[model samples]
Target: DGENLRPVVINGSNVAMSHGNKEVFSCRGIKLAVDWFLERGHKDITVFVPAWRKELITDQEILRKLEKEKILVFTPSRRVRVVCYDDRFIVKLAFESDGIIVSNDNYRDLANEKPEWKKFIDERLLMYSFVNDKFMPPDDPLGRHGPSLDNFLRK
Candidate 1:
């Protein structure tokens, strides 16, 4: 069952922000994405969450649950909510492991400021979105579609 265990680093704040909806306030996007990967034999996953965005995350319990399932949730030491802080960690982890990054942020604007981000964005980034109760690729149905996790474990 655990065939495709490709390591994936997630941008936790980005995923949680995408889950901001009145109807689905309980099911955080990061949780949905993680669950999708786990179910699809992609268990080698790590989620990087900025400490500043901790309160904004809706499904706080999901992080603990995921940890119990073996997915690592890392909250890096960043005092303020700067764009670069979050982007840097996500990129750094992805580059270090040569793994894919899952986030909605393309980090293109930061490329001019941080030139090294270009290669990571183009080659390693895998952006996905939560839409209509499904976690799919960013703004494109033709892209890799994740599963619909409504009926799956929400806590």
Candidate 2:
């Protein structure tokens, strides 16, 4: 009951890529990130992955579990069925729910285009570190900005 009630937006693909192996899309990265948040009492966690990578998830079982929980979401291309704007979806969700976004991504490119995401990115963004089966997160359990930027320094 102490955890903040704001929704948490997760960049699933980005976090997956941050894994140590860094070869294929590892669902464990996402799982670890989700578990990290869950341990802190965040229940409204949302994950966004490009629709194209939908078939690349080797860990189908974990994907199914996240999907069943309605946290795993696919970003649509609207034409080719996949696009780079999954970051856009993350941004959209964060603003829509007045939520916080989890990922090491700076979204600098997106901010260059939209210019609106800058505030949210700098203020509400929750950059994380995924390595060695560890997911480093901000120290503030219910706040946005934290003293520990260690999450940005991925091992």
Candidate 3:
């Protein structure tokens, strides 16, 4: 249990709104979030974002640079379907790696799919806040939301 005992998987869509303004997509939000973990000692970090959003991501350089560096990754949606549901995949990725989830998403829809995932989220999730170009440590998990993060991942 040294550094990054629990690896990290980020919800890129949910984090794009890291500033709390869900519409103002900041490509840098992903880097900012990734950097926080990197600096905090989480070496194995993965970010799941939709490829379509790449068009709107402000500061596209981070996307190119980070992807080249392998810190950020995108799930390209199929031609007929749009919702990549990367949210659920993020949960699965974290679960498979015994990692921690970094996002504001509570995944109610995914939880309703199965009970196992609900428990998994309760244990592995970390709620966060990014505002004014500042990164905050994980927020309260027990102080609110039924001793878990029912705070709902606002995407």
Number of the top candidate by TM-score? 3
Segments of candidate 3 deviating more than 4 angstroms: 1-4, 78-81, 144-155
Reference-based TM-score of each model:
0.68, 0.79, 0.81
The C-alpha RMSD in Å for every predicted model, in order, reads 7.0, 5.2, 5.0
- Model 3 score (lDDT): 0.72
- The true-structure Cα RMSD of candidate 3 reads 5.0
Model 2, which residues run further than 4 Å from truth?
1-3, 77-84, 138-155
Model 2 TM-score (2 dp): 0.79
- Backbone clashes in model 1, listed as residue pairs: none
Q: Work out candidate 2's RMSD over C-alphas.
A: 5.2
Ranking under TM-score, best-scoring first?
A: 3, 2, 1
- Cα-based lDDT for every prediction: 0.62, 0.73, 0.72
lDDT of 1 by residue, 1-155 (tens): 33334467887766776776633434367777877777766657888765444342366777666656666455655534443366777677777766677877777765556667786566556766567558775433123353222211111
Worst 10 residues of 1 by lDDT: 146-155
What C-alpha lDDT, on a 0 to 100 scale, does residue 122 get in candidate 1? 62
Backbone steric clashes in candidate 2, count: 0
